[PDB]
Design a protein around this nucleic acid. Structure first.
Ligand SMILES: [Mg+2]
Ligand SMILES: [Mg+2]
Ligand SMILES: [Mg+2]
Ligand SMILES: [Mg+2]
Ligand SMILES: [Mg+2]
Ligand SMILES: [Mg+2]
Ligand SMILES: [Mg+2]
Ligand SMILES: [Mg+2]
Ligand SMILES: [Mg+2]
Ligand SMILES: [Mg+2]
Ligand SMILES: [Mg+2]
Ligand SMILES: [Mg+2]
Ligand SMILES: [Mg+2]
Ligand SMILES: [Mg+2]
Ligand SMILES: [Mg+2]
Ligand SMILES: [Mg+2]
Ligand SMILES: [Mg+2]
Ligand SMILES: [Mg+2]
Ligand SMILES: [Mg+2]
Ligand SMILES: [Mg+2]
Ligand SMILES: [Mg+2]
Ligand SMILES: [Mg+2]
Ligand SMILES: [Mg+2]
Ligand SMILES: [Mg+2]
Ligand SMILES: [Mg+2]
Ligand SMILES: [Zn+2]
Lengths: 50, 57, 155, 102, 69, 62
RNA sequence: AGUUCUCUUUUCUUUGUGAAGGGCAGGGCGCCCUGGAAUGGGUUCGCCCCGAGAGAGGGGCCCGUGCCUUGGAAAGCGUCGCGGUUCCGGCGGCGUCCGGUGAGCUCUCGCUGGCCCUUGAAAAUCCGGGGGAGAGGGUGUAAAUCUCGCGCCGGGCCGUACCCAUAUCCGCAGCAGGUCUCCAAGGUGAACAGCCUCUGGCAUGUUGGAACAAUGUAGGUAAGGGAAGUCGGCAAGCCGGAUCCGUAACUUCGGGAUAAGGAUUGGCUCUAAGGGCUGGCAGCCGACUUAGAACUGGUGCGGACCAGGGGAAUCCGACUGU
RNA sequence: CGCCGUUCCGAAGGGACGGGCGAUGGCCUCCGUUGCCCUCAGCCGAUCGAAAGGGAGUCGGGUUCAGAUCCCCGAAUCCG
């Protein structure tokens, strides 16, 4: 809702920032195995629970 | 005809969400939120049903 | 081109609907690069964006029929759906009658056509449904005055 | 009192598309007074014509827009409403103008 | 806004330490002198055009003046 | 703005059926930010340079 | 601005003024003063009021969201016309006008009543009064003091987008489900019914093309008969609005009851009645209603929509409610 | 671990007009502040509990791609 607590708005903001693709220079790192961000979240497909 | 909306987040018709229509210099109807109606003092005698005079309500 | 943005902006600037915004089909290239309200205002002034007039909803047909009804047309037994009371409530009819007749009695008493004693007697008869309208009451008062005057002459 | 109105057909007449004398006649037989369009009320409405401006005067109430309605009617009769536009010049006048095309 | 009736009271208002400016507005029927003070905009309405010019000269020197159009 | 322009423009666009594939982008065919007076001034500087040098050479040639 | 073949002085759109202050309407008073009322009077749609003071006069107070005024025309809007870099709160002209009406709808303020073996919050917070402990100066350079008018300084913290639902929420999903509210136009009509339209919105609901077989699902219509069908009239059908007439058994006298049963209903042209204001009369304004009559159409007229089939009985449970 | 209980088995007031004793300062004149004593003192229940209840006070115009009773213009107002 628009009516929000500071603690909830701060939790949501951190979930916003984690929800990005990995930098593409991570790919060239020497021992890298990560291909993509496997922890991407979609606001419609899966819900935060809070 | 022009249809109105509340100007605040209280979407409910409670005692504290009363309004009156107001035409503005822009020639439109908006809501102005009214103040509750005040009451003149009641006589301390506890007998007279009317309220007092010379006192703002 | 895809003029969704301009249609939305023109609508906001003109204070109308998106259905009343008219974008010049010959000028779509010019309109396509107006990405601000300032440019949309310019195109409105130039004439590549116009507000279309309201669609006509004439009242002439009903105005004509209302004149016919004022003359009694289209009001017969076959054109009634609510009850006589629903169409004209009895309470309102009585209320109109009482105010008319009580107003006349007051003016007769103030003008001294009748005295307070005759006003009071007639007031309670008016409330009794004795008189149907203003005329019948006025003719009754005339009769009373004649009889009252005759008795005074004999007295 | 007195009411007076004028129509300015200078732009069209000078371009030889329209005759003021014909229009003055058209107003003469059409302008209605109490619904009658024959006698102009019995001279109550007076019509005068200058070189290019037609003037109408009345000793009874008369509507300026009525002239616009008749002028647009006359313009349609002579197939002009796609070129000429009736506009208000002042509180007391109309004039005929060309749509800004080309 | 407050409305001032007399010329003397307007002049006292125009000389107040908090007065910030005077606006002259000319209409068809009156000339309005409005002085912006701390709390209220005081307005003097004059119907005599001649008195308006006489008053326009009497305004305090330092007080900034603006004629509206 | 004359509201009759909606009709004129609407009808005009409907004429595009006959020139499909070569419709004109803009009807309002009708500016150099470079002012004509300044453009002429710039011409007086650049173009003439070759011409005058020839004349000065000509002057020194007689 | 639309229409203009014919008619239409026509049809459509549009035609502002905030808060706060001042003034004035209007509304309300179980407020005051004179006076003393039966031949009782005043008075409402209803009521209801008076020697514990009515009528009638003259005042006072409260609310004034209405109008005027400052705000404020400088703005906004309409329209016409000019300019620019032309992505300017650009600049100019004109206008933003005068009346009527209503059981109309919505909101609100107020008065008065009804209902209760139902009587329909608390607190923060603010105010007035009663008292008179005290304080203030000694006639002025006046003091204590002031809820009056100006003036001076400040108001930190968190929320604020957007969706709000046949696609932003919950049902595993863009799910025919579920999910709390506010505003609410014209016509017909009793009506927030249904049907059509304007403002606003949409693109037929997770695809299209071509055919028009059966069997379906959903709608209809059927000669003659009329429940013979079936466990059973299931289903469908009949009735239906309104006006006028008329209405039984039985009954707890309230009902039963729209019992049952009839007649009427369009269009057009008229007639009568039902009011207000100014000065048994005259003039000027007006709001929809009702009744009656003539004429009239291929007997069609609640013409769509909306809209009870009825009666005689038996069993059970009084009823409304779950 | 805890639970009951919310005024009930409690020395539950850390406040104040004023007065008297001192101490410190300053626009050192005399006033503040401050410590103690005297005097006065029901609240009787910590605290939490509503983005629909109570609760002072903001409106008009303009402005953006997306915010506005919050930004800008103008006019106000409550509290301290
Ligand atoms: Mg979901
Ligand atoms: Mg609240
Ligand atoms: Mg107002
Ligand atoms: Mg008082
Ligand atoms: Mg009754
Ligand atoms: Mg009295
Ligand atoms: Mg203006
Ligand atoms: Mg006292
Ligand atoms: Mg928002
Ligand atoms: Mg379909
Ligand atoms: Mg489709
Ligand atoms: Mg869907
Ligand atoms: Mg489907
Ligand atoms: Mg059959
Ligand atoms: Mg048959
Ligand atoms: Mg059988
Ligand atoms: Mg059988
Ligand atoms: Mg059935
Ligand atoms: Mg029966
Ligand atoms: Mg039995
Ligand atoms: Mg039962
Ligand atoms: Mg239950
Ligand atoms: Mg709390
Ligand atoms: Mg709260
Ligand atoms: Mg502010
Ligand atoms: Zn009392």
């Amino acid at each position: 809702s628009s009516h929000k607590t500071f603690r909830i708005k701060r939790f949501l903001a951190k979930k916003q920032k984690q929800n990005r693709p990995i930098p593409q220079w991570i790919w060239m790192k020497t021992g890298n195995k990560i291909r993509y961000n496997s922890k991407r979240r979609h606001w419609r497909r899966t819900k935060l629970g809070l | 005809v022009q249809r109105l909306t509340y100007r605040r987040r209280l979407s409910y018709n409670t005692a504290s969400n009363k309004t009156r229509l107001s035409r503005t210099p822009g020639n439109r109807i908006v809501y102005l939120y009214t103040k509750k109606v005040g009451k003149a003092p009641k006589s301390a005698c506890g007998v007279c049903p009317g309220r007092l005079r010379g006192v703002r309500a | 081109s895809m003029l969704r943005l301009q249609k939305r902006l023109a609508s906001s600037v003109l204070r109308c609907g998106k259905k009343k915004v008219w974008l010049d089909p010959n000028e779509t290239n010019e309109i396509a690069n107006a990405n601000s309200r300032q440019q949309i205002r310019k195109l409105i002034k130039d004439g590549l964006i116009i507000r279309k007039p309201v669609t006509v909803h004439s009242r002439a047909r009903c105005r004509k029929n209302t004149l016919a009804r004022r003359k009694g047309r289209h009001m017969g037994i076959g054109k009634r759906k609510g009850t006589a009371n629903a169409r004209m409530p009895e309470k309102v009819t009585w209320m109109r009658r009482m105010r008319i007749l009580r107003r006349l009695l007051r003016r007769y008493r103030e003008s001294k056509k009748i005295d307070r004693h005759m006003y009071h007697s007639l007031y309670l008869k008016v409330k009794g449904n004795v008189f149907k309208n203003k005329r019948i009451l006025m003719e009754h008062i005339h009769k009373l005055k004649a009889d009252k005057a005759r008795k005074k002459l004999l007295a | 009192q007195l009411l007076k109105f004028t129509l300015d057909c200078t732009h069209p007449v000078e371009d030889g598309i329209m005759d003021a004398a014909n229009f003055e006649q058209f107003l003469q037989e059409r302008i209605k007074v109490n619904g009658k369009a024959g006698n102009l009320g019995g001279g109550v409405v007076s019509l005068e014509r200058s070189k290019s401006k037609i003037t109408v005067t009345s000793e009874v109430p008369f509507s300026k827009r009525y002239l616009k309605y008749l002028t647009k009617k006359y313009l349609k009769k002579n197939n002009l409403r796609d070129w000429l536009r009736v506009v208000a010049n002042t509180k007391e006048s109309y004039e005929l103008r060309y749509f800004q095309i080309n | 806004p407050r409305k001032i009736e007399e010329i003397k009271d307007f002049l006292l208002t125009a000389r107040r330490k908090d007065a910030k400016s005077v606006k002259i507005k000319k209409n068809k029927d009156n000339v309005k002198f409005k002085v912006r003070c701390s709390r209220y905009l005081y307005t003097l309405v004059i119907t005599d055009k001649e008195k308006a010019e006489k008053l326009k000269q009497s305004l305090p020197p330092g007080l900034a003046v603006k004629e509206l159009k | 703005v004359a509201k009759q322009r909606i009709r004129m423009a609407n009808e005009k666009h409907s004429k595009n059926i006959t020139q499909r594939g070569n419709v004109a982008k803009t009807s309002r065919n009708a500016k150099a930010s470079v002012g004509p007076w300044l453009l002429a001034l710039f011409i007086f500087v650049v173009c003439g340079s070759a011409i005058f040098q020839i004349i000065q050479s000509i002057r020194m040639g007689m």
